[PDB]
């Protein structure tokens, strides 16, 4: 069933692959060649997770955990019950994520909009592939990837972090956190500002964008503007994810020690390394 304005947009074409063969909708969902692909990989990965729960011997969805191969397998294929299922599910996940992005591209083409959305999603995919693919193959074993389980992937985060002491001292991780915190701030302000303009005090007229500028200028002396805030929210989010991937791909590959020790390069700059007093003297 259509939205009341939808029919004029449901035209042929814009597909990357398959022509008219898959150019149709299943309810609201557009299919396309990559919709077929996405559904197959998603369904297969989901059912293989459920089968991995059968092998694990638990039905508690919080305890279900598909572990990658042990380090002794290196980058080879493992027995299915001993990490080969993680390998297949990782291929399914990658297939589903890439198919989903490519399906968004042909939806963009049919609607005539820009490609910003699938481009933005590719950053999330590349962060995922950093943790399951690029970093494990640099480090030479699949067993450095995280397990697919709701709480057990947090054990991987904890164990990976404390391998390098307090992981807060990773400088790229500090930058990534700052973008994440800044993005959530900007999202709160942006949501509140648009709503405060559209939903004024009782019985008042809708506020204009000029009132939106005025409120922020009055509050902080600056307004980035209606275009600038959407540019900002995108770039803050993407920068957070880019610096997240960077902070991990360097960890265990070019940096190996306690991350707190890295900051000694500043303290031991020769023009002040020996001056007595302070914290480091």
């Amino acid at each position: 069933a259509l939205l009341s304005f939808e029919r004029k947009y449901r035209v042929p074409g814009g597909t990357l692959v398959g022509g008219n063969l898959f150019d149709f909708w299943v309810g609201p969902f557009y299919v396309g060649f990559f919709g077929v692909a996405t559904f197959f990989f998603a369904a297969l990965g989901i059912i293989l997770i459920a089968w991995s729960a059968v092998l694990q011997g638990t039905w508690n969805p919080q305890l279900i955990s598909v572990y990658p191969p042990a380090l002794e397998y290196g980058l080879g294929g493992a027995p299915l019950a001993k990490g080969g299922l993680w390998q297949i599910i990782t291929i399914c996940a990658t297939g589903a994520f890439v198919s989903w992005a490519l399906r968004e591209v042909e939806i963009c083409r049919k609607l005539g909009i820009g490609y910003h959305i699938p481009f933005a999603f590719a950053f999330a995919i590349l962060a995922y592939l950093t943790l399951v693919l690029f970093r494990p193959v640099m480090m030479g074993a699949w067993g450095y990837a995280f397990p697919y389980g709701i709480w057990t992937h947090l054990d991987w985060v904890s164990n990976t972090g404390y391998t390098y002491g307090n992981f807060h001292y990773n400088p790229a991780h500090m930058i990534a956190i700052s973008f994440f915190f800044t993005n959530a701030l900007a999202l709160a302000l942006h949501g509140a500002l648009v709503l405060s303009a559209a939903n004024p005090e009782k019985g008042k007229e809708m506020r204009t964008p000029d009132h939106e500028d005025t409120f922020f200028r009055d509050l902080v002396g600056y307004s980035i503007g209606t275009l600038g805030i959407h540019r900002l929210g995108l770039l803050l989010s993407l920068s957070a994810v880019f610096f997240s991937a960077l902070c991990m791909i360097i960890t265990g590959t070019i940096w190996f020690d306690q991350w707190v020790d890295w900051w000694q390069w500043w303290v031991k700059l020769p023009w002040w390394a020996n001056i007595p007093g302070g914290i480091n003297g």
């Binding site: 572990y67 990658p68 191969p69 042990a70 380090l71 002794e72 980058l75 990490g83 693919l133 690029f134 193959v137 640099m138 480090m139 030479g140 067993g143 450095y144 995280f146 397990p147 054990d155 991987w156 164990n159 990976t160 391998t163 265990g252 590959t253 070019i254 190996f256």
Partner: protein, 55 residues
């Protein structure tokens, strides 16, 4: 006529295989890049402990 039709069917299937191959081989090349880089870095000396209880 029929040899032209036979070649056309084969060509259409080879287009699909060629793209599926190209993407697959390109994926393996990207994996090989990170493997080569990881072989050049000091990782072999400084191998991290297993983050998972599976070892």
């Amino acid at each position: 006529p029929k040899t032209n039709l036979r070649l056309w069917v084969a060509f259409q299937m080879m287009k699909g295989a060629g793209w599926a191959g190209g993407v697959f081989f390109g994926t393996l090349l990207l994996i090989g890049f990170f493997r080569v880089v990881g072989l050049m870095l000091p990782i072999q000396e400084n191998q991290a402990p297993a983050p998972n209880i599976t070892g």
